Subunit: 287 residues, 4 copies
């Protein structure tokens, strides 16, 4: 009962933005028929219910808990439109609480919900280099493998339901605080009189910055903050992680500070790349 | 022009984990090595030891300094027994220690009064990179004096960054130290959340090796931390000192750095609990909090 | 319209813990008849009749006062087949003194509107000693006319009613005050810890700080208690840390950078992990232990 | 040898700014003869003779009081052939009221000992209004008998002398109180900022916070001034942020984790960068402007 294009050709999306649309292109190449629902308007369906009624597998890619609940539940929601025995793959970055609510609601419809957020942004989605972080029973993960293989380079089975959502929060913290650390360290360097191009070029050559953050640093050198992961979404992910860390009573001061810097970043420019904090701190130092 | 032919003798003020490793690559490149340490001992028993900084400098052509902090630097640089009193006008002093911008300016000016150019040339990389001569040299000074020292820098490292005039190497080292320190505290806290939320420890450590948002340095520390291996490459006492220097400098420049400030406090706790183990032991500290 | 004991004698509580039980005694003294629902069926007041469900509580009260720990407990007891809201008559008032999120507040206000029920968000400034002495400060969101209706209830349990604005304003003002209280304590605990680490005599240091103008009366009381190792719960760490989580979530939703509040929250997470049930001021003891090793 | 006006009438000041000139007024009233040295030779007190060097100041004074901004200024005027120590006599007392580091305090104490001069580290709690009213709290480190020698001086300028311990204890206790003051302000600025960002009425919010028990009297006075946009300096951001820098350096040297104090320090760096000379409470305005955009 693998979800190959032979057994399950129709994949309906709930949400179809920068990430899901690039996933869909890869699933199309792999031989699936793609449909999609978005509250605004590949064939578009009018409701989540209608989307689910004409799909074999539903993939969800929505911004937050509120959007997830608005489209999963109620008589016009996605769950009302799928059939016992089918699978719902949620690739959204949402809270552990929302993950548990949807898993339990899926169980009442006979629908297995995999929490399968991804590591990687729009360039990795373009190249199908996403890393899938999936929670669920190993047998249900196996059913979704052709889907995961088409959109990504690696599927990490993180544990039972909820484990993928948690692993995504871990990686989001590392990403977000990695950027705020870099912006702050660059700002000190500029404030202490270091030549800007020297400094940016020097940091490209050290081993203590990630490949992801080195790519952001190079873009920031030219002032390029075209959105790959917009500040509004990075800051939301930081909010979710801090809430989850507080619920577990784990003290995370570096992540907490980073979140506040990303709040400023979102306020000043919600739609540019989250790396624009580098420019924000540069402007603080120049004034 | 400080090739082994022209200037074969390199004397070290301080000769511990980093400097003894640099000394081996300089020995291999053809230089004659000598050292001073306050204890009279070092990891390299085959290196002649001199009784004072003054005595070390009087029998070396170039002096390399590698001491723990500002206070150690002033103790061995100044006064009638210090290194400056022993070097000759026109020679180079190369400071690879991680010290404050204030200490750097004090030594440069003191050097000028002796006719000695002081390059502030801290390095990026730890004991594994010193072993393999993969250090990145971060050097402040005039471009002509930097060119004079290139044979020395090439022997101990894989890249020399001319950061600007005197003081620029010290500042760039502070920048890179902040990225390293807060990179570790970020990773320790993120791992701690994951464990507190029920993720299998072995799965989580292995999964994070697979993602592009952790640096190669911090991936190596995560693998060591999976093994409980915190043998000192960069001890907490020195990493936390370096964070203290960075936050002092950021406050003097009035630059708000909340992520770096949070990370420093986590590294204070790390040093308090274990000053001599690797600074990455914060990962173990956080694991014990969540247990 | 005024919810005096003559016009509306029956006050039913959803939640009846440390704070609500003390408000109930002042409401009993003012002439009201008190009833309550809790999930355990128990309360600090054995004389108070217990109803078996939130719906049953609401069906036999003229006014309902809610005092529950968090958003989840609120939703569990106001909504669903046995929730309290559907048990209330049109034109009646629901008074929520719980410290919950602005989102939970907006959801309850809108659900109340659908049922014809006015919901006042009326959290309180003060802890169990202020509840004991009816010296709470009520922070209330709603229309002036609806606040006026609740005035005899607010007057019995508190010393001052601040009309913070329309619906949601009380909840927001409570979060502001919570932030000041939480970070005031973490600031004090960390400053004391430096002092002790630098060799200052403990008794001298605690007494000296009682003499300075830069500590609040509330935190000076906590400092004297901490000198005695007295962390009997007035505001337990589990609830203070929850309130800080709510404040940081709200500040993130508004995109306001609050690094001092964010750091304080992490210190209170450690405090709650080590002792969820003692007073939140126990971080002072936590920090003393860190510097002693 | 009590340092009464009859026993030691001449008090010479090293530094004579906002704090010291007010101290000197109260010492003049108490019967002392005041002189001063400043690097600019300028001071708002016309009756105070200005001496041209720290050396010259100390040579014509019986007791020397120091009130300089930081470690660097202290070392410039204390040491060397033209410094103050070179001009005082064995058996005299130097009273340092400056807010300086523990390291600077130890260095001056030991330098004083080589000169036979006892150095009391005696920073003060309180700002320009407290110096005007001699309401300062003196925080003094040293031997009990030397503190007793300085009692008439301390009584003239303040309302309370806290003997914090041996040499260095006053410097450390000042750092403790500075942290409480600075983080108390940043907490308050961020909490107000959240409340405004969440739509609360500004005048409502400022007036409500004046009524709560979790804000100190000092910070309530700052909040009232901020309601009017008044940040005329009493304690300028450049000096408060310097004191926070000293506290965080000392906390790092003691390896004490203080995340709330560290976060507050960074907010006060932003405050100093935007306006070094206005009152440190100007962060309230900084945060209002962030939220207003
Ligand atoms: N680099 C990245 O972009 C990363 C993204 N993620 C996560 O992936 C998810 C989406 O990312 P991205 O695709 O970039 O975000 P986008 O904002 O680009 O796409 C958002 C999509 O969600 C749709 N949507 C909004 N509300 C609803 C709703 N109530 N029901 C159904 N669909 C809805 C929008 O449709 P409309 O146009 O009608 O609003 C749009 O199609 C988020 O959870 C994000 O955090 C995680 C890591 C990295
Ligand atoms: N990963 C690392 O290890 C990194 C190191 N650095 C910087 O390099 C410098 C040294 O690091 P490392 O070599 O690891 O530290 P070590 O402690 O291993 O070496 C310290 C050396 O300094 C000597 N020393 C101490 N006080 C004095 C003094 N007053 N005069 C002369 N020598 C003295 C010690 O001699 P004795 O044994 O007699 O005390 C020992 O030889 C520090 O500034 C450190 O921050 C920078 C980045 C990373
Ligand atoms: N100083 C303080 O204590 C302050 C408290 N507050 C806020 O006041 C509220 C109550 O505080 P406090 O009285 O101290 O808390 P307590 O923990 O002392 O009492 C909690 C009460 O809520 C009840 N409860 C739990 N879950 C539910 C539910 N789903 N439905 C109904 N009742 C429920 C408990 O009943 P059971 O025993 O059956 O669980 C108990 O009666 C919280 O929001 C707190 O943050 C605000 C400021 C200060
Ligand atoms: N609320 C406050 O203002 C409080 C301040 N403090 C501490 O008290 C000290 C001074 O505070 P305040 O008086 O307000 O600061 P001011 O800036 O008002 O006065 C500074 C004084 O120091 C003098 N000065 C500067 N450098 C030297 C030097 N090298 N040698 C001698 N004198 C020097 C200046 O002289 P010139 O004018 O010639 O530069 C000026 O007279 C600082 O340590 C401050 O942190 C402590 C408690 C309260």
């Amino acid at each position: 009962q693998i979800l190959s294009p032979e057994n399950a050709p129709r994949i309906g999306f709930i949400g179809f933005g920068a990430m899901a649309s690039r996933m869909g292109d890869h699933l199309k190449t792999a031989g699936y028929t793609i449909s999609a629902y978005t509250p605004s308007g590949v064939p578009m369906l009018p409701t989540p219910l209608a989307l689910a009624k004409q799909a074999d597998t539903v993939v969800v890619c929505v911004p937050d808990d509120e959007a997830l609940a608005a489209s999963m539940y109620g008589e016009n929601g996605a769950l009302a439109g799928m059939t016992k025995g089918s699978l719902l793959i949620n690739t959204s970055s949402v809270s552990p609480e929302a993950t548990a609510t949807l898993y339990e609601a899926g169980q009442k419809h006979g629908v297995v919900v995999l929490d399968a957020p991804v590591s990687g942004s729009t360039p990795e989605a373009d190249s199908a280099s996403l890393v899938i972080l999936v929670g669920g029973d190993k047998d249900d993960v196996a059913r979704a493998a052709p889907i995961f293989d088409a959109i990504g380079k690696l599927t990490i089975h993180a544990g039972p339901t909820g484990s993928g959502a948690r692993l995504k929060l871990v990686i989001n913290g590392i990403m977000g605080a990695g950027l705020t650390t870099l912006a702050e360290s660059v700002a000190y360097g500029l404030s202490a009189g270091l030549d800007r191009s020297m400094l940016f070029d020097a940091l490209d050559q050290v081993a203590v910055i990630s490949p992801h953050h080195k790519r952001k640093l190079k873009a920031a050198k030219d002032g390029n903050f075209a959105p790959q992961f917009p500040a509004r979404l990075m800051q939301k992910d930081m909010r979710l992680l801090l809430d989850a860390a507080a619920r577990e009573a784990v003290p995370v001061p570096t992540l907490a500070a980073a979140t506040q810097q990303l709040s400023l970043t979102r306020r000043l420019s919600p739609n540019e790349d989250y790396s624009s904090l580098i420019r924000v701190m540069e402007k603080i130092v120049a004034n």
